[PDB]
Amino acid sequence: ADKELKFLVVDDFSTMRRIVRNLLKELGFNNVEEAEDGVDALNKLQAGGYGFVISDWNMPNMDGLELLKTIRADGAMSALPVLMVTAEAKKENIIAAAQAGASGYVVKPFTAATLEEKLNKIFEKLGM
């Protein structure tokens, strides 16, 4: 529940990144960064500082899961929380996310009120 948590809003789409941003806003979150892909993100992540990957499932060069497995077979990034943002609540996504090691999932578009609740539980389970 850090209203400053560094959200790597990994998504290749700007307006969404913007309302996500504005809702984070009406809810009080204002610290949001944008990335456009997995190599970019992996490159970006090969850097560091990222705490929450609000990663859209899909991107070019390397997607959400390769991102996630490479993330996982690699010594250094093996345990980052990745909130897979998904357009819809689906099981295999939910499970593959689970077997390759993902942290949680959410469905857009949400009201300020909903985004509000999901964040709460991951925070909960990871101990945040």
């Binding site: 290749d12 789409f13 700007s14 307006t15 969404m16 913007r18 309302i19 504005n22 809702l23 456009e36 859209d56 899909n58 070019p60 357009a87 609540a89 099981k91 939910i94 499970i95 689970a98 077997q99 993902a102 942290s103 949680g104 999932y105 857009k108 578009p109 949400f110 009201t111 300020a112 009120a113 539980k121 909960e124 389970k125």
Partner: protein, 225 residues
């Protein structure tokens, strides 16, 4: 207050117009026989972005139209599909139609049904043609329906009960809500703090374990009777 979408639309409409203009220019600059990888990636990303926005706001016709184009652009960018002038012209026509669909939504109007059917039909025809007539040799020639029709119908009686012990305030409702995403719960005993329900067996024990594990832990989970 009240997340109204009839203004989160304006930002989308503007982004979409811009992405449609970019799509058009990239398409016009593409060299079919040797498409610049970076240019195709941009066309694909514009389409992916427009599709997600269309899904978020329930713009059915635009979403499906963009969906079909995106899959095609993915094939071409991965190098699985060859491009030519006809295909590029179809993409341009697709961009033209998507713009008309967007312009209808801007006016709180419904897009053109006939143009929608025509473009989707053409896009699906191309994908089909991009296939060389089904896969090589017969596939799924057996792996399909395996084990014949089970004896009773769905497990004789070994659903295994899942016992979720130790849940929180609103978690009863919520986990009820979450297990409700993976599987279906019956005999929902909503105790003050518990949730028991019988379990179907539709997911490897090893995997149910894995997802509940997004909200709860491996030992909170017992499989027995």
């Amino acid at each position: 207050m009240s997340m109204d979408i009839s203004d989160f639309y304006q930002t989308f409409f503007d982004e979409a117009d811009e992405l449609l203009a970019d799509m058009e220019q990239h398409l016009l600059d593409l060299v079919p026989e040797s498409p610049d990888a970076e240019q195709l990636n941009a066309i694909f990303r514009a389409a992916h972005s427009i599709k997600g926005g269309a899904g978020t706001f329930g713009f059915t016709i635009l979403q499906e139209t963009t969906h079909l184009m995106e899959n095609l652009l993915d094939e071409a960018r991965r190098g699985e599909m060859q491009l030519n002038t006809d295909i590029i012209n179809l993409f341009l026509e697709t961009k033209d139609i998507m713009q008309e669909q967007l312009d209808a939504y801007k006016n709180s109007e419904e897009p053109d049904a006939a143009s929608f059917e025509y473009i989707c039909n053409a896009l699906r025809q191309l994908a089909l043609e991009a296939k060389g007539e089904t896969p090589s040799a017969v596939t799924r020639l057996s792996v399909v329906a395996k084990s014949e029709p089970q004896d009773e119908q769905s497990r004789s009686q070994s659903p295994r009960r899942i016992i979720l012990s130790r849940l929180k305030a609103g978690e009863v409702d919520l986990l009820e809500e979450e297990l409700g995403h993976l599987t279906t719960l019956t005999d929902v005993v909503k105790g003050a703090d518990s949730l028991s329900a019988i379990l179907p067996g539709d997911i490897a024990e090893d995997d149910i374990t894995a997802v509940l594990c997004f909200v709860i832990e491996a030992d909170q989970i017992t499989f027995e009777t």
